[PDB]
Amino acid sequence: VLNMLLSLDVLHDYDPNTKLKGNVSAPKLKKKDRVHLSKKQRKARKEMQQIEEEMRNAEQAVSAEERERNQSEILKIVFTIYLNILKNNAKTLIGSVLEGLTKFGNMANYRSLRLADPLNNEIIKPSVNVS
C-alpha cells in the first residue's frame, strides 16, 4: 500500500530533452487538397487560431507554475507520512520508508512477505529495499 507513493511522477525530474515515443503524422494538409472556405470563414479561422495560440501559451505557463506548488504540497505530505511511520516504528515498513526517503530526499529543499510487487519492478531495481 505504502509503495504506491514511490511511483509519484511529480517527484521526478528526467533529462531535459528525453526521447519520447516515435510519433509520425502529416505536418500539414497539402495545398492542392484543401477545402474551400469563404472569406468570412477564413477570417474566423485566423481569429480562432490566434485565440488558440495564446490559450495554449497560457495553459503551458499555468501548468508549469502549478506543478511546482503541487510538488511542494505532495513533498510535505509524503515526508510527514514517512516520518510518522518512522516514529511509530513499524518493523514491516522500514525498507519502503527508507527507499522513499532516498528517492525523494533530493526533491526537497523479505520480498516473500509482501504482495503485488511495485510497478515496473523489472526496471526499478530497489536501491534500499533489497530482498
**Closer to RNA at the Cβ: 49 or 131?**
49
Give the whole-angstrom CA distance, residue 13 versus residue 53: 27
Smallest distance, RNA to C-beta of residue 39, A: 8
Smallest distance, RNA to C-beta of residue 55, A: 15
User: Which chain residues interact with RNA by CB under 7 A?
Assistant: 27-32, 34-37, 42-43, 45-46, 49-50
Cβ neighbors of 92 (< 8 A, separation 6 or more) are: 113
Handedness of CA 66, 69, 107, 10 (dihedral sign): negative
Smallest distance, RNA to C-beta of residue 30, A: 6
**Closer to RNA at the Cβ: 37 or 108?**
37
**Closer to RNA at the Cβ: 46 or 114?**
46
Cβ neighbors of 78 (< 8 A, separation 6 or more) are: 5, 8, 11, 100, 104
Smallest distance, RNA to C-beta of residue 61, A: 20
Alpha helices in 1-131 (DSSP H): 39-88, 94-104
Helices vs. strands in the chain: H and E counts, helices first: 2, 0
Give the whole-angstrom CA distance, residue 49 versus residue 31: 18
**Closer to RNA at the Cβ: 47 or 59?**
47
